[PDB]
Amino acid sequence: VGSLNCIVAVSQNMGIGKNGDLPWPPLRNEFRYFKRMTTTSSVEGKQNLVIMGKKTWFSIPEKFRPLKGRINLVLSRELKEPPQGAHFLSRSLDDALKLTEQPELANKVDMVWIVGGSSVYKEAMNHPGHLKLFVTRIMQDFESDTFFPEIDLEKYKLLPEYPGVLSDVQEEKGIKYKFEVYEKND
Numbered sequence: 124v125g126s127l128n129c130i131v132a133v134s135q136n137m138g139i140g141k142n143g144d145l146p147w148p149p150l151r152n153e154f155r156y157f158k159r160m161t162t163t164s165s166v167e168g169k170q171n172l173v174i175m176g177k178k179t180w181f182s183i184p185e186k187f188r189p190l191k192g193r194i195n196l197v198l199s200r201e202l203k204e205p206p207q208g209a210h211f212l213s214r215s216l217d218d219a220l221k222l223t224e225q226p227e228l229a230n231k232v233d234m235v236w237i238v239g240g241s242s243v244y245k246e247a248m249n250h251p252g253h254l255k256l257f258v259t260r261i262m263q264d265f266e267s268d269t270f271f272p273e274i275d276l277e278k279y280k281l282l283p284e285y286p287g288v289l290s291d292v293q294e295e296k297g298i299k300y301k302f303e304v305y306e307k308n309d
């Protein structure tokens with residue numbers, strides 16, 4: 124199995140959702156970046172795995188569920204089988220990463236992308252090991268009810284650039300944003 128990553132878009136007041144919807148108007152090119160990063164696999168004959176909580180799965184419009192060309196795993200203790208359209212279910216992030224060693228996935232999965240929600244990001248960000256965070260900074264405040272956890276800059280280093288990631292300021296629908304990549308190894 125390859126690298127462990129989180130990917131998120133976040134407003135200036137740390138918002139990542141409002142009642143299960145985007146806090147901001149849809150940004151087409153920002154979503155195209157999410158699809159490219161999460162879908163593109165370095166290794167022949169493997170796909171990347173996306174891991175998400177239950178409320179993040181059901182936030183996705185039905186037409187975009189499952190994320191095509193990626194293996195889709197949902198975290199839940201209440202569900203007893205994967206939701207309609209999903210491929211795998213685990214009770215926790217720790218269990219999911221353990222599954223990734225088992226015979227039905229060990230040779231199938233390249234990179235692992237954690238796509239939400241807040242408590243799933245917090246557990247991944249606070250566990251030891253090598254982890255990257257791909258953070259889109261949406262450069263204004265938007266009303267939110269769910270937030271990204273604190274990034275401890277002691278341990279996460281902001282990289283000076285990264286291949287396939289634009290380093291300058293972007294703008295769609297009058298909203299400025301920029302892409303960043305953070306790396307820890309502890």
Ligand SMILES: COc1cc(Cc2cnc(N)nc2N)cc(OC)c1OC
Pocket residue numbers: 130131132153154155156157158175179180183187188190238239257258259
């Ligand atoms: C959980 O699935 C998706 C989540 C998002 C939100 C999102 C949007 N942008 C970035 N950089 N990260 C994110 N996590 C965007 C997506 O597609 C554009 C998803 O596929 C359906």
Ligand SMILES: COc1cc(Cc2cnc(N)nc2N)cc(OC)c1OC
Pocket residue numbers: 143144145149154182183184186187
């Ligand atoms: C999956 O890509 C997403 C797109 C949108 C806005 C949106 C965009 N297009 C359509 N057809 N329906 C929508 N609700 C909203 C989303 O979440 C609320 C998405 O998932 C993160």
